[PDB]
Structure 1
């Protein structure tokens, strides 16, 4: 189905992205790790320790259940219920002294935009990231692409009170049209809410825009400089040749279009390949 193909595609994106920035021996902190479904991707990249934190205890309980069913892992796994964005990370990790901080990588998949609820939370998130990382370490992940959101929003006239677009498997509905009323510009980088539906994945959840220019500028204030901002489509096109013969021959089959080549097509193309972007930054200096 379209949604199965979207999930396979996103998993391939994550496999490639994790391998790109993770190397043998690394310690990874995964913010907003959810149910912890990427452990084997970090394992394949050779990590020595995984630390996952999520605000949802239900998700962490499930992440722990999944982890405990695994056998003979070469790396340590620490899973913590805690707020990664609105509170200092020291609160969450105080009772887990086995965590090896500073770490080599911080990752955050399909979640960092939650930190853009307010400026306070965006800055607390960035402080948590830089203080956790070694100088030279990387911060990477996957977020809704504000540049694609702005393209869609620029095609919606100001007369529409709740700007919306979508297709048979996904929908975006903005809470207000302040963007269009403000000359097609968000009045603030923070708290710009839209409801997001993705079939069998995201049940009409309020989400916040993460304007990339603001994210980049803020990151620079905390000593992090841009490494990557390719949209999912371009990232996949460029990386899949290194990657065809490495994937699970079933995941390989799951990445095949009708025309026989690798990617996504049909109703899944827009949410899978355009709506999301990769991101990465490198910590080049200490936040003083």
Structure 2
């Protein structure tokens, strides 16, 4: 594939994120879990329990199979439901709630983000963490102003008719080689997210771009790097990976 380095970079960053906020025996609530790729990662992390939730039944299906045919130590749970736009009560708290490449889908509407943030807060143990990897609105708009919103690997189209402020835009279409097609994404209203979380007892403790994060952790953990071809990136690739940022909140 032409997206291998990108995939490896993203998994690495994700692996480092997990490594940074999870301790042995932790309980993890993976939201928008998808096919459950992070299962192997949580395994190396020695977590005690893993709960996977995704609105797409088709995704949960692959996650189940995955958890079923893998050498794992933690207990596993799965549920196919909307964890952002519909009330959720799994009946227990977690040490770490993870949303990898999907919490932005929680910004469809004002009410939607509210439910989502409230769903994260009621399932998070005091002191627990909410780790995430969301697309950066600042980045996307700046690239917008550069008139360069694509290349071989991806493409982004902002939805804005005549007489419409740029800052007014709340969604765009995203396409990634060997992945989503004209997939609609909602911009992360950072300030609204932060505030909303502050009222629920969660405060921001981290926010860094994928390239710097990639670079930093890379110069501080060369071992896991080599363990997956991680050793550099082209400019085209870096632009895809450059789209995202790491954001962590903590229930204080």
TM-score band, normalised by the shorter chain? over 0.9
| 1:108 and 2:99 are equivalent in the alignment | yes
Matched with 1:269 is 238
Per-residue Cα deviation, 1:147-205 (whole angstroms, up to 9, x for no partner): 1022123445xxxxxxx721111000012157x833x4226xxxx22110110021221
3-state DSSP class of the match of 1:229? Answer: strand
Which position in structure 1 is the counterpart of 2:59? 59
Corresponding residue for 1:255? 230
Equivalence for 1:181? 164
Return the offset for 1:2.
4.2
Pairwise mapping of residues 66-105 of structure 1 onto structure 2 (< 5 A)?
66-71=66-71, 73-90=72-89, 93=90, 101-105=92-96
Gaps of 5+ in 2: none
Q: Would the aligned equivalents of 1:140 and 1:279 in 2 still touch at CA under 8 Å? A: yes
Name the CA distance, whole Å, in 2 between partners of 1:115 and 1:32: 10
Equivalent pairs, count: 252
Rounded to whole Å, the distance in 2 between the matches of 1:132 and 1:231 is 27
Post-superposition CA distance 1:257-278 (Å, at most 9, x none): xxxxxx3223111011x20001
Structure with bigger gyration radius = 1
**Match of 1:281?**
249
Unaligned runs of 5+ in 1: 95-100, 157-163, 257-262
- Map of 1:169 onto structure 2: 153
Counterpart in the other structure of 2:208: 230
Q: Which residue of 2 aligns with 1:211?
A: 189
TM score, norm. by length of structure 2: 0.94
| Superposition deviation, residue 250 in structure 1 | 4.5
SS at match of 2:23: coil
* Residue equivalent to 1:98: none
Question: CA-atom RMSD, angstroms?
Answer: 1.7
